[PDB]
C-alpha cells in the first residue's frame, strides 16, 4: 500500500484546564458547563473534536511504514498473516517470553512477514 | 448558509431494515429484495415491505375470512404476509391454495385434509416470481384491545374511546361525566 498520508491534526485535543489542575487529567471531556468558553467556541481557546477532523477511509489506522499493525500472541497466529503480509505488519505482544519471541521472530522470517518489535528482548 | 427547511437532509418515517435476528426471515427478505429490485413487478416490492413489518401488522387472518375474500376467485393463490389461524365456527373448511408465513397446526390439518395446498413464501417464488394471478391480503390492523383506547380521549363529546379502567361494572367510572344526574353528560 503506502499511499499518500495526510493528517489534518497532529496535535492532540487536551482537556480544558488540564494544564491548570493536576486532578483534571488530559483525556478529553466535552465541557458541558453553561458558561464555558470552549463549548460556546470563542476564539483563542481549546479546539473541540468534530467528525470534520476524521482521516481518510483509505489510510485509517495506517502506520508511517505503510502497513496496518495486527498484534499477535503465539507462533500459530502469524500464519494468519501470510497472504496479507504486504498489507500487515505484526506487533509481537506485551507479555511474551524471550523464548517464545525467538520462536515467533524466527517463524516470521520463514514467512517473509515483517515484525515491528525487533531486538525485542536480547 | 441556505434558507432551507431543516436543511434536509429529510428522513423517511417507515422502517428501513429487518429488526429480527430470526435467520429464516432474514433470508426470506434477501430473496424478496433480489426479486423486488430485479423483476420490476410491484407485487414483489409490496411483499418486501410487508415482510419487514412488526408483529401487530402481521396479524392473524382466520381460515373463514380467507374463504370470503377468495370466494369468486377460487383458482388464484391466496397470499398473506402474516399468520393463518383455524376458525372453529367454520364447519367445512374450503380447500383454497394459501401461501403465508405461518399456519397454526389446526389450520394446516384442516386445509390439507380438505384437498388444499399449504405453501411457504420461498415455494411461491418458484411458482410465481412476478406474482402473476395472485391475491394479496392482510388482516385488519386496527382491531385490537389496544386500538380501542386510541382517538379523541374518552371524556370528550362524541368519542367512542375506551377509558383505561382497572375493573368493569358500576362503581368504576359510571357517575360524574357519564350521567346527566351526576353533573353532566359528555
Amino acid at each position: 500500500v503506502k499511499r499518500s498520508i495526510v493528517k489534518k491534526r497532529v496535535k492532540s485535543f487536551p482537556r480544558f484546564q488540564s494544564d491548570r489542575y493536576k486532578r483534571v487529567k488530559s483525556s478529553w471531556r466535552k465541557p458541558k458547563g453553561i458558561d464555558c468558553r470552549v463549548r460556546r467556541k470563542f476564539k483563542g481557546t481549546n479546539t473541540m473534536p468534530n467528525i470534520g477532523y476524521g482521516s481518510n477511509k483509505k489510510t485509517r489506522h495506517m502506520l508511517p511504514n505503510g502497513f496496518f499493525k495486527f498484534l499477535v500472541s503465539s507462533p500459530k497466529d502469524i500464519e494468519l498473516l501470510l497472504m496479507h503480509n504486504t498489507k500487515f505488519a505484526a506487533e509481537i505482544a506485551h507479555n511474551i517470553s524471550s523464548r517464545k519471541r525467538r520462536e515467533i521472530l524466527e517463524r516470521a522470517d520463514q514467512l517473509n512477514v515483517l515484525v515491528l518489535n525487533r531486538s525485542a528482548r536480547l | 448558509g441556505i434558507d432551507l427547511e431543516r436543511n434536509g437532509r429529510k428522513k423517511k418515517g417507515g422502517r428501513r431494515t429487518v429488526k429480527s435476528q430470526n435467520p429464516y426471515l432474514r433470508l426470506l427478505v434477501k430473496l424478496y429484495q433480489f426479486l423486488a429490485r430485479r423483476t420490476n413487478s410491484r407485487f414483489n416490492a409490496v411483499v418486501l415491505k410487508r415482510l419487514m413489518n412488526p408483529k401487530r401488522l402481521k396479524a392473524p387472518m382466520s381460515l373463514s375470512k380467507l374463504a370470503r375474500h377468495m370466494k369468486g376467485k377460487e383458482d388464484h393463490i391466496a397470499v398473506l404476509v402474516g399468520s393463518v389461524t383455524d376458525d372453529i365456527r367454520m364447519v367445512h373448511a374450503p380447500k383454497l391454495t394459501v401461501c403465508a408465513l405461518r399456519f397454526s397446526e389446526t389450520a394446516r390439518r384442516r386445509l390439507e385434509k380438505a384437498g388444499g395446498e399449504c405453501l411457504t413464501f420461498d415455494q411461491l417464488a418458484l411458482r410465481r416470481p412476478k406474482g402473476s394471478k395472485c391475491v394479496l391480503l392482510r388482516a385488519a390492523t386496527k382491531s385490537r384491545e389496544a386500538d380501542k383506547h386510541f382517538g379523541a380521549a374518552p371524556g370528550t363529546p362524541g368519542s367512542k374511546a375506551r377509558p383505561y379502567v382497572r375493573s368493569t361494572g358500576r362503581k368504576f367510572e359510571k357517575a360524574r361525566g357519564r350521567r346527566k344526574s351526576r353533573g353532566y353528560k359528555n
Binding site: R29, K32, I34 | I88, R89, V91, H92, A153, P154, G155, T156, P163, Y164, V165, R170, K171, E173, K174, A175, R176, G177, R178, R179, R182, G183, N186
Partner: protein, 145 residues
C-alpha cells in the same frame, strides 16, 4: 440490563435528564391520586370521566356463582362435540345431541349461523334468538336443571 438504560448514556450530563430550570424535586403535585378534585381536575375530565360519585344500589355480601353464567354461541356448538358431524350429515334419522353443560356452558345465544343438520341442544338457558335459529335448522331444544 442496567447496560441498556438511559442513565448510563445520560451519565456525564449534569442535569441527569431532568432539566436545569425545573429540577427533579421530591414530590411536586402531591402524592398518588391526590389533587384530583382541584389541581389535577383537567386530567380527570377526559381520560377518566365518571370517576366521582356513586350510582347504583349496593349489594351486601354479593356472592359470585349465584349469578355466574358462561355462554356459548350457536355459531360454535359443533366445535363442542368431528366424527358425529359425518354421522349426523347422513342417515336422516336420529340426531347428534349436544349437552352444552358437559363442555361447561349454561346459556346458548344465537350470534352465529349453523349448518342445516338436525340436532338437539340441551342447555340451562336459551336466548330468544338462539331458539329461532335452532328450530330453523330442524333442531330441538331441551332444558336441564
Amino acid at each position: 440490563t442496567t447496560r441498556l438504560r438511559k442513565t448510563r448514556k445520560r451519565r456525564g450530563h449534569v442535569s441527569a435528564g431532568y432539566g436545569r430550570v425545573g429540577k427533579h424535586r421530591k414530590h411536586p403535585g402531591g402524592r398518588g391520586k391526590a389533587g384530583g378534585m382541584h389541581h389535577m381536575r383537567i386530567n380527570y375530565d377526559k381520560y377518566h370521566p365518571g370517576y366521582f360519585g356513586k350510582v347504583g344500589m349496593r349489594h351486601y355480601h354479593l356472592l359470585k356463582n349465584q349469578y355466574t353464567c358462561p355462554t356459548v354461541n350457536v355459531d360454535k356448538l359443533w366445535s363442542l362435540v368431528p366424527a358425529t358431524l359425518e354421522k349426523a350429515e347422513q342417515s336422516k334419522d336420529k340426531a347428534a345431541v349436544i349437552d352444552v353443560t358437559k363442555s361447561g356452558y349454561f346459556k346458548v345465544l344465537g350470534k352465529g349461523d349453523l349448518p342445516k343438520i338436525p340436532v338437539i341442544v340441551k342447555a340451562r338457558f336459551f336466548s330468544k334468538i338462539a331458539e329461532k335459529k335452532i328450530k330453523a335448522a330442524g333442531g330441538a331444544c331441551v332444558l336441564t336443571g
